[PDB]
Design a protein around this ligand. Structure first.
Ligand SMILES: [Ca+2]
Length: 223
């Protein structure tokens, strides 16, 4: 997260860290046994880390649970990042509490102008690299589809939305991948891609979760 703020320990209780010996992606806990992340975060041997603030210090509220199954969206296109969404089933159900909690799926899509919370342990610099150990937060509006398509001609599908600031300086970044965009208490986005980070006229592009609720629900019901 570039230009964000320190969330505060466990203030984003649905935020997960995907760990393969190191943090490599974020995710969102959507029920006690399922995590949603980005398909471009797919790899084998994922441990899901819940209740994290400092990902380098055991602080007392963590739950470390291995993934038993990962399901990349059937139409994920890694070249275009269309349908950049994946489900991860935990080997055992997480213990839900005030600091580890699921985030609700949307019943409707959020409109441009809605303010959302984006969070992650990604890079905090737009040039160079500095990775924080504690969770960073960014409040950002959803941008209109027209401004989104104008920033990224030919690259925005109906399964994507832009959020952020056309003036730059505030954005998600590498390592925030797969993490949540939460608007009015609902998971509306997944950190997916962007041109660099926090660059002028290059807002973040997010997977449009409301388009996948039926797939998510059907998949969880049968797996
Ligand atoms: Ca920790």
């Amino acid at each position: 997260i570039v230009g964000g703020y320190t969330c505060g320990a466990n203030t984003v209780p649905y935020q997960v860290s995907l760990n393969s010996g190191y943090h490599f992606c974020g995710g969102s806990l959507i029920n006690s046994q399922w995590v949603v992340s980005a398909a471009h975060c797919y790899k084998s041997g994922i441990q899901v880390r819940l209740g994290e603030d400092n990902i380098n210090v055991v602080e007392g509220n963590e739950q470390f649970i291995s993934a038993s199954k990962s399901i990349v969206h059937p139409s994920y296109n890694s070249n275009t990042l269309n349908n950049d969404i994946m489900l991860i089933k935990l080997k055992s159900a997480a213990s839900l509490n005030s600091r580890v909690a699921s985030i609700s799926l949307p019943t409707s899509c959020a409109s441009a102008g809605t303010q959302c919370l984006i969070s992650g342990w990604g890079n905090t610099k737009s040039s160079g690299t500095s990775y924080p150990d504690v969770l960073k937060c960014l409040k950002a509006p959803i941008l209109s589809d027209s401004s989104c398509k104008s920033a990224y001609p030919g690259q925005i599908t109906s399964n994507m939305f832009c959020a952020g600031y056309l003036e730059g300086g505030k954005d998600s970044c590498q390592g925030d991948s797969g993490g949540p965009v939460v608007c009015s208490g609902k998971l509306q986005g997944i950190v997916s891609w962007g041109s660099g980070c926090a660059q002028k006229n290059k807002p973040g592009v997010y997977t449009k979760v409301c388009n996948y609720v039926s797939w998510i629900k059907q998949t969880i019901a049968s797996n």
